[PDB]
């Protein structure tokens, strides 16, 4: 079910301590290049589940070439998922297994280590400004982008009529609008990822990248609505579950 409040408080404390290590600017040379020259390997991570289970999950790490977006590395494996899902605490469920996959990549094919990881879930667009993409980035020290498929309603952000009016105004792939918190902060961007998709992605900084670069790279990874590194990790982990079950 739901962890007790004292557990959630401990987790909140750890998130606030680790947030001090988030770097929300560009630290990689390819990031400031108008065409991302020098970017060669983009990672994606996801965890799929089997219905009725809650103990078993499949965690996948893929690495794709850039800009061709072909899969050059895949590790999909079964894991014994502990913690339940609680909004705002996604990392405490998934991130320790994702870190293990990165370490296995380091040990098995270190030349294919990704230069940036696209994470299925938010970064600083988060209840305490420290989502799963930040958490992964800080623990692995890799640049990370948070990509969410629906709006986390925090800091006054709401999926109301005005928000949906703004989504209608997004007309083609690459079009965006900023997610401005009540605090005066830009927490992320709504991105229309494709010409033939109207439901936006919600993109935010995970670690070691600026928001404007994160959005533009995310856009360049979209053959479909979901950025191809996450899409392949999503597709491959679900297939793995089905193949062994
Ligand atoms: Mn996911
Ligand atoms: Mn799903
Ligand atoms: Mn998924």
Curated annotation (Swiss-Prot):
GO terms for cellular component: cytoplasm; cytoplasmic stress granule; nucleolus. Changing residue 87 to P: No effect on activity. It is found in: Cytoplasm; Nucleus, Nucleolus; Cytoplasm, Stress granule. One of its GO terms (molecular function) is single-stranded RNA binding. Mg(2+) binds at residues 46, 120. Its EC number is 3.1.26.-. Endoribonuclease that specifically cleaves inosine-containing RNAs: cleaves RNA at the second phosphodiester bond 3' to inosine. Active against both single-stranded and double-stranded RNAs. Has strong preference for single-stranded RNAs (ssRNAs) toward double-stranded RNAs (dsRNAs). Cleaves mRNAs and tRNAs containing inosine. Also able to cleave structure-specific dsRNA substrates containing the specific sites 5'-IIUI-3' and 5'-UIUU-3'. This is Endonuclease V. It comes from Mus musculus. The gene is Endov. The chain holds residues 7 to 251 of 338 of the full protein.
């Amino acid at each position: 079910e739901r962890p007790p409040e004292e557990t959630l408080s401990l987790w909140k404390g750890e998130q606030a301590r680790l947030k001090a290590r988030v770097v929300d600017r560009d630290t990689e040379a390819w990031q400031r290049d108008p065409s991302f020259s020098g970017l060669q390997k983009v990672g994606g991570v996801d965890v799929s589940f089997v219905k009725g289970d809650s103990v078993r999950a499949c965690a996948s790490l893929v690495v794709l070439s850039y800009p061709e977006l072909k899969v050059v590395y895949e590790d999909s494996r079964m894991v014994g998922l502990k913690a339940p899902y609680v909004s705002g605490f996604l990392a405490f469920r998934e991130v320790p297994f994702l870190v293990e996959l990165v370490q296995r990549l380091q040990e098995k094919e270190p030349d294919l280590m990704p230069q940036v990881v696209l994470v299925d879930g938010n970064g600083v667009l988060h209840q305490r400004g420290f989502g799963v993409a930040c958490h992964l980035g800080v623990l692995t020290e890799l640049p990370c982008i948070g990509v969410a498929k629906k709006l986390l309603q925090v800091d006054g952000l709401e999926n109301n009529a005005l928000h949906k009016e703004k989504i209608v105004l997004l007309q083609a792939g690459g079009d965006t609008f900023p997610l401005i918190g009540s605090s005066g902060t830009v927490l992320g961007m709504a991105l229309r990822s494709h010409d033939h998709s109207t439901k936006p992605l919600y993109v935010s900084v995970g670690h070691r990248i600026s928001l404007e670069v994160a959005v533009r790279l995310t856009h360049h990874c979209c053959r479909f609505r979901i950025p191809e590194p996450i899409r392949q990790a999503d597709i491959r982990s679900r297939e793995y579950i089905r193949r062994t079950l």
